[PDB]
Design a binder for this molecule. Structure first.
Ligand SMILES: N#Cc1ccc(NCC(F)(F)c2ccccn2)c(F)c1CC(=O)NCCONC(=N)N
Lengths: 11, 249, 26
């Protein structure tokens, strides 16, 4: 459902 | 938000989305009160009866958003949390008394057309504006009924007299809460709901034209039920705790 | 500081669609 975010942030 | 409408672009530039890293999902609303501090509800982070206990590293804050699910490239800013502070006397055991938390961002966020902090009330503003009948505004990406919006939702609701708030529920109400919503006779509806928690209840000062956050979406029984009301954390009442945390950390 | 004044509204002297409902209730 949620568009993936740039991945910088999934830390 | 139940019985709300699509917000306009930039209508609520202090609105923050609390976003869970994994699984990726909407956790809660929140509000931006400076370039570095975010205000939300304690139950968003900590609620043991549902095994809820998030830490700094579980979460992302997403500022400047409109669309709920889209990654709004060049518009939203995403931030990491440096430190979460829950009110010491948050009563999750009984009635969500003092349902408030502060979140320090890793780095200051740059303000823009879509990102801008809301004011915190002083005693005079609170005295003047927090009265039965006066309307505030709630925003959020929460459920539309007790099913999810594509865009930020908005609804305007009146503050309700304390005795009416007390007589609607079996929960013990404190001075750190107020309730808002239409009476069943008033023939208009609206409420926050699941997913709206921690979002801002705001009012616009007729004296200086500034938006002030008076409340934090806290709790209710169901959503938009007749004869039931939304409950909000009373922000001004907890302001000394807020000021304490901020100029100390 | 500059709190509570929206870039796309108050700062341009533009009103949002339901803002009026709040002020009328005061
Ligand atoms: N975490 C938590 C939690 C536990 C019980 C709730 N409601 C049951 C209860 F009212 F009985 C209750 C009240 C106080 C404490 C314990 N139980 C509750 F709302 C919440 C938070 C939540 O869902 N917020 C949604 C936004 O409010 N919804 C609305 N405005 N219509």
């Amino acid at each position: 459902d949620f568009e993936e975010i740039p991945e910088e942030y999934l830390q | 938000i139940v019985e709300g409408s699509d917000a306009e672009i930039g209508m609520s530039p202090w609105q923050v989305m609390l976003f869970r890293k994994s699984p990726q999902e909407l956790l809660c609303g929140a509000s931006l009160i400076s370039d570095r501090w975010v205000l939300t509800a304690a139950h968003c982070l900590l609620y043991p009866p549902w095994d809820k206990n998030f830490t700094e590293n579980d979460l992302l804050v997403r500022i400047g958003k409109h669309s709920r699910t889209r990654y709004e490239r060049n518009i939203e800013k995403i931030s990491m949390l440096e430190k979460i502070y829950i009110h010491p006397r948050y009563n999750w055991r009984e009635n969500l008394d003092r349902d408030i938390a502060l979140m320090k961002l890793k780095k200051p966020v740059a303000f823009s057309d879509y990102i801008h902090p809301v004011c915190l009330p002083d005693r005079e503003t609170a005295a003047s504006l927090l009265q039965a009948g006066y309307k505030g505004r709630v925003t959020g990406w929460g459920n539309l009924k007790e099913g999810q919006p594509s865009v930020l939702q908005v609804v305007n609701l009146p503050i309700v007299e304390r005795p009416v708030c007390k007589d609607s529920t079996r929960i013990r109400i404190t001075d750190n809460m107020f309730c808002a919503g239409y009476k069943p006779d008033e023939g208009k509806r609206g409420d926050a709901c699941e997913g709206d928690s921690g979002g801002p209840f705001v009012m616009k000062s007729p004296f200086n034209n500034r938006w002030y956050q008076m409340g934090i979406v806290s709790w209710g029984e169901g959503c938009d039920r007749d004869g039931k009301y939304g409950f909000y954390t009373h922000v001004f009442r907890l302001k000394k705790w807020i000021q304490k945390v901020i100029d100390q950390f | 500081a500059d709190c509570g004044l929206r870039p796309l509204f108050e700062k341009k002297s533009l009103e949002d669609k339901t803002e009026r409902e709040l002020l009328e209730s005061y």
